Amino acid sequence: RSLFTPRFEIKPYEYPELLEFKDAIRHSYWLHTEFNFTGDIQDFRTHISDVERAVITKTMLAISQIEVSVKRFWGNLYNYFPKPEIEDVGGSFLESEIRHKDAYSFLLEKLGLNEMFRNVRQYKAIMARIEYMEAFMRKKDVSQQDFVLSLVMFSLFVEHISLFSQFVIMMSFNKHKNLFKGISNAVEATSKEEEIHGRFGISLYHLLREEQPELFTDEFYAELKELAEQAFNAEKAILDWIFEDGELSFLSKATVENYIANRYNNSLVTLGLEPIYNISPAQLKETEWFDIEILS
Amino acid sequence: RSLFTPRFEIKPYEYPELLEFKDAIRHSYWLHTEFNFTGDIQDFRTHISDVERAVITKTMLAISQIEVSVKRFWGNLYNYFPKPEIEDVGGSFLESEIRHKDAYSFLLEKLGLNEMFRNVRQYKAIMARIEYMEAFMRKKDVSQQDFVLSLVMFSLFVEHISLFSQFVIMMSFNKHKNLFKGISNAVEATSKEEEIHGRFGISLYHLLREEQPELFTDEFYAELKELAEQAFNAEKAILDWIFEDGELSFLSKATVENYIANRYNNSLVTLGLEPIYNISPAQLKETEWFDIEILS
Ligand SMILES: [Mg+2]
Ligand SMILES: [Mg+2]
Ligand SMILES: [Mn+2]
Ligand SMILES: [Mn+2]
Ligand SMILES: [Mn+2]
Ligand SMILES: [Mn+2]
């Protein structure tokens, strides 16, 4: 049994447990047309302060900078792991990313953000994210080991963390102020699907660690740690930018930073590595409603 | 404007009209778990003749030989036409083919046809189909002209013709005898999506004819006609095989042949070529109910 070995016949499956990720993404299926964003537009116009409007503007630009794009990694995974069950999951995930793109493209239009988004790659903090996401993928085609590192970084640090500070910010407006219910619904649906995407990569990692332990060298983990540090520093910079004009009365920048730092620790621990950030349990209690909503 | 030219920015779309095929396939979305097949299994065991059982067995094997496979052409289209709107349609189409695969894999298992399907290449007519489908694709990466020929043959023949004799056969049991209602519903839903798939390819053909006329040489059309004839001969052989133990009391082989010969003529006319076959109006009237059902 090897993930890298092509298999022509559909059945019997070699990795039947992976099909649960296809079942999961079918259950999570959603389209933005299931929500009416009229109340969100009203909220953006007259129910928030200028400080809050600046936060929401930059948070939605940051979400869209990932979601409003062509995302083909999961759809292409079969080229590296040529298994029928890999294509079943990867192609279903790619379609889910089309649905996400349509949702956030619609929201950019409705919030009047198209012009700002056209220039989004101008913001220094966005450039920092682009830098690490490009670094994550740069060598994916060089070797099996380099591909596996790209897969791990994408699954555990992009899919499970990059957008989550923005997801928490947007859903916090609904939790604390009963505002932006439509965007809260779209963000919740998106979060659940990104959780599924990253968990697929975690399963692949555990399989790969058993099948080809020689890929997982000291050098592999040292580079992974360096890349994860670059990613966290960039997502902190995104938070500094989002809150540059003032913080929210109901959710501080530090609390959001603590939330994603805990997710970096969790990803490192999932990989077998040590956690490195000192987490506030009190601030985690402040945001734990989000994890209960997304995962329960 | 050129389909071969990469575009990075999502909006504005260069080919916004192609997004209607994404809308269409979202509207047609279905899973086989929406249907109860228990009545169909009982029908297969107890409510049909030995002649009818042979027809259904081979017809379901023939549908499955295409549908129960790894089908990546639409997902890979972006590699050749690197447009966001192409990925939107192609990725959504690929996911629809995963749903088709799951439906017919389920029906193979429920009808006890797994072992027959494992040996489906023993059948001469199936080998004839494999041969033309391989011929359609084997040069797709040699040149732009070869890729477009593969795209045209896949669109106008594999998606619009290959399975449709089998779709008509399966839905005819419900139409004339109120049997196999579950499979009728699944085949109807499959037919609607294959219609959408082929229509997308037709739209691409018309665009390419205008943008890239240098591809559509006398030699291109000569090779197209040769491949189309090879494919139609093979689908006639599939029909001969499906009915070789006897024809149905309510639907003759000639009537089904006439139906697909008309579709074949129509694909040729769509391409600007002459129709090949004389078509019986009376037999077309016998199967008109099917086109009404699919096109509603
Ligand atoms: Mg909920
Ligand atoms: Mg109907
Ligand atoms: Mn997404
Ligand atoms: Mn994702
Ligand atoms: Mn299909
Ligand atoms: Mn199709």
Question: Is residue B106 classed exposed, middle or buried when 0-12, 13-18 and 19+ CB atoms within 10 A define those classes?
Answer: middle
Q: In degrees, to the nearest 5, what angle opens at C-alpha B293 toward C-alphas B101 and B243?
A: 65
Taking chain A, what is the end-to-end CA distance rounded to the nearest angstrom? Answer: 34
Nearest to A74 by CA among A97, A48, A42: A97
DSSP B214: G
CA–CA gap between residue A102 and residue A98 (Å, rounded): 6
What is the distance, to the nearest Å, from the Cα of residue B270 to the centroid of all Cα atoms in its chain?
A: 16
Q: Is the dihedral of CA B153, B156, B159, B162 positive or negative?
A: negative
B133 — phi, psi (to 5°)?
-65, -35
Most distant CA pair in chain B, distance: 59
Cβ atoms of B267 and B242 within 8 Å: the answer is no
CA distance A191 to A173: 16
Distance A188 CA to ligand 1 centre (A): 7
Which of helix, strand or coil describes residue B251? strand
Give φ, ψ of A244 to 5 degrees: -60, -30
Residues 6+ apart with CB under 8 A from A81: A3, A4, A204
Neighbours of A140 (CB within 10 A): 18
Which residues make Cβ contacts (< 8 Å) with residue A155, sequence separation at least 6? A197, A198, A200, A201, A202, A204, A205
Chain A interface residues (partner B, CB cutoff 8 A): 9-11, 22, 26, 31, 68-70, 72, 75, 78, 84, 87-88, 91-92, 94-95, 97-98, 101, 105, 114, 118
What crossing angle do the helices spanning B253-270 and B164-177 adopt, rounded to 10°? 140
Nearest CB among B11, B69, B91 relative to A75 is that of B91
* Sign of the C-alpha dihedral computed for residues A144, A149, A150 and A155 taken in this order: positive
- Please tell me whether residue B60 adopts helix, strand or coil conformation: helix
**CA A222 to CA A53: how far, in whole Å?**
40
Please indicate whether, in this complex, the C-beta atoms of B11 and A87 are within 8 angstroms of each other.
no
Amino acid at B57: T
CA distance B293 to B281: 19
Cβ contact B26:A98 at 8 Å: no
In this structure, what token pair is assigned to residue A72?
């083909």
Interface test with B, best of A30, A73, A98, A104 (most B CBs within 10 A): A98
d(CA A252, CA A232): 18
B20 is in an annotated binding site: no
Q: CB neighbours of B173 closer than 8 A, spacing ≥ 6?
A: B43, B52, B56, B179, B180, B183, B184
Q: How far apart are CA A78 and CA A67, in angstroms?
A: 22
Asked if A153 and A228 touch (Cβ cutoff 8 Å), the reply is yes
> What does the H/E/C string look like for chain A?
CCCCCCCCCCCCCCCHHHHHHHHHHHHCCCCHHHCCCHHHHHHHHHCCCHHHHHHHHHHHHHHHHHHCCCCCHHHHHHHCCCCHHHHHHHHHHHHHHHHHHHHHHHHHHHCCCHHHHHCHHHCHHHHHHHHHHHHHHCCCCCCHHHHHHHHHHHHHHHHHHHCHHHHHHHHHHHHHHCCCHHHHHHHHHHHHHHHHHHHHHHHHHHHHHHHCHHHCCHHHHHHHHHHHHHHHHHHHHHHHHHCCCCCECCECHHHHHHHHHHHHHHHHHHCCCCCCCCCCHHHHHHHHHHHHHHHC
Instruction: Give the CA distances from residue B216 to residues B77, B88, B208, B210, in Å, rounded to whole numbers and listed in that order.
Output: 19, 27, 9, 10
Resolution of the structure, angstroms: 1.7
CA B120 to chain centre: 18
What is the distance, to the nearest Å, from the Cα of residue B81 to the centroid of all Cα atoms in its chain? 22
Helix or strand (DSSP H, E) at B232:
helix B218-242
Region of residue B260 (left: phi > 0; alpha: psi -120 to 50; beta: else):
alpha
Residue whose entry in the numeric block shows the structure tokens 């009203």: A42
C-alpha torsion angle, residues A116, A118, A124, A126 (rounded to 10)? 100
Amino acid at B215: L
**Cα maximum dimension of chain A:** 59
d(CA B87, CA B78): 5
A10 contacts on B by Cβ (under 8 Å): 68-70, 101, 105
Ligand at shortest distance from the CA of B184: 2
CB-CB contact of B204 with B3 (8 Å):
yes
Q: Name the residue with tokens 């699944």.
A: B186
A170 neighbors A187 (Cβ within 8 angstroms): yes
CA of B174 to the centre of ligand 2 (A): 12
Q: What are the DSSP calls for B188-210, one per residue?
A: HHHHHHHHHHHHHHHHHHHHHHH
Q: What is the CA radius of gyration of chain B?
A: 19
- How many CB atoms sit inside 10 A of residue B160's CB? 23
B231, B255 in Cβ contact below 8 A?
A: no
Q: What phi and psi, each to the nearest 5 degrees, are found at residue B277?
A: -110, 140
Sign of CA dihedral B187, B192, B197, B202: positive
* Alpha carbons B261 and B279: distance in angstroms, whole number: 7
Say which amino acid occupies B124. Answer: K
Q: Which of A262, A295, A290 is nearest to A278 (CA)?
A: A262
How far apart are the C-alpha atoms of B208 and A218, rounded to whole Å? 52
**Helix extents (H) in B68-143:** 73-80, 84-110, 114-118, 124-137
Angle at CA of residue A112, ends A109 and A116, nearest 5°:
100
Q: Which of A199, A107, A209, A125 is nearest to A159 (CA)?
A: A199
In contact, B250 and B176? CB cutoff 8 Å: yes
What distance in Å separates the CA atoms of residue B260 and residue B233, rounded to the nearest whole number? 11
DSSP state of B281: H
Size of interface A-B (CB pairs under 8 A): 58
Residues B126, B238: contact at Cβ < 8 Å? yes
* CB crowding B85-98: b at 16 or more within 10 Å, else e: bbbbbbbbbbbbbb
Q: State in Å: Cα B189 to ligand 2 middle.
A: 8
In order, the DSSP letters of B19-44 are: HHHHHHHHHT---GGGS--HHHHHHH
Question: Where does residue B266 rank: exposed (0-12), middle (13-18), buried (19+ CB within 10 A)?
Answer: middle
DSSP code of B121?
Answer: G
Task: Give the span between the Cα atoms of A129 and A239, in whole angstroms.
Answer: 11
SS3 B62: helix
Instruction: Map tokens 């079943």 to a residue.
Output: A88
Token readout for B212 is 């890239």
Per-residue burial over A7-32, b if 16 or more Cβ lie within 10 Å, else e, is: beebeeeebeebbebbebbbebbbeb
Question: Which residues is B248 bridged to in the sheet?
Answer: B251
Q: Residue B49 region, left (φ>0) first, then alpha (ψ -120 to 50), else beta?
A: beta
Q: How many CB atoms lie within 10 A of CB B252?
A: 14
Q: What are phi and psi of B284, to 5 degrees?
A: -60, -40
DSSP state, residue B18: G
CA distance B227 to A245: 65
Tokens found for residue B269:
């006319």
